[PDB]
């Protein structure tokens, strides 16, 4: 085998024990990724270099069921909810899939200095079609939680 070793830093956050680094590796072979070796390391000790701490989590796939014009009216009323010019399929009856990604930067181990969530809102048709009925874009700084995930 011939394997091409690619890696990037998925997160470096300073826990209490020390400071930690998350390494996501991808071993490719014949141009195609074969297995991802993730890994965490611990520079143990006391750290306050919060200027460079951050994380890219893949938010848990979630399933939101619109059932009332009240429900839909709120899912639209959201700032971060951006409906698409695909089809005007009544989002009323069906349910939606929210597969999101997000990046957070820390300041206090308790308070995110800034957070951004991007994702794709999916709908499955009766035909088993998967469409990007919309997408998710939200970002704020000095946040204590993720208002998008929470809603979901």
């Amino acid at each position: 085998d011939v394997l091409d070793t690619t890696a990037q830093i998925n997160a470096v956050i300073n826990q209490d024990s020390g400071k930690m680094v998350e390494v996501c590796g991808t071993l490719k072979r014949d141009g195609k990724p074969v297995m991802y070796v993730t890994s965490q390391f611990l520079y143990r000790g006391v750290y306050t270099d919060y200027e460079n701490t951050f994380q890219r989590k893949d938010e848990v796939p979630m399933q939101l069921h619109i059932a009332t014009p009240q429900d839909l009216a709120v899912l639209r009323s959201k700032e971060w909810f951006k409906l698409d010019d695909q089809h005007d399929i009544e989002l009323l009856g069906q349910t939606l899939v929210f597969r999101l990604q997000s990046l957070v930067r820390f300041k206090n181990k308790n308070v995110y200095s800034s957070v951004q969530t991007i994702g794709q809102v999916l709908l499955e048709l009766p035909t088993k079609e998967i469409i990007q009925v919309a997408s998710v874009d939200y970002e704020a700084g000095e946040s204590h939680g993720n208002p998008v995930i929470d809603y979901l």
Partner: protein, 49 residues
């Protein structure tokens, strides 16, 4: 029955959204921040002049 709906429906949405955006603030700002910035309505007592 149409008019019945629309009215109840728009009010529902309207006051629902409020609760939503109210919750959003408790997440972003934290319990402490949002708490300490709410109109403190005084509760009446009784003084016997």
């Amino acid at each position: 029955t149409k008019l019945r709906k629309e009215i109840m429906e728009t009010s529902a949405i309207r006051q629902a959204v409020i609760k939503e955006t109210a919750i959003e603030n408790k997440v972003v700002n934290g319990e402490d921040h949002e708490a300490l910035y709410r109109r403190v309505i005084t509760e009446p007592r009784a003084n016997l002049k």
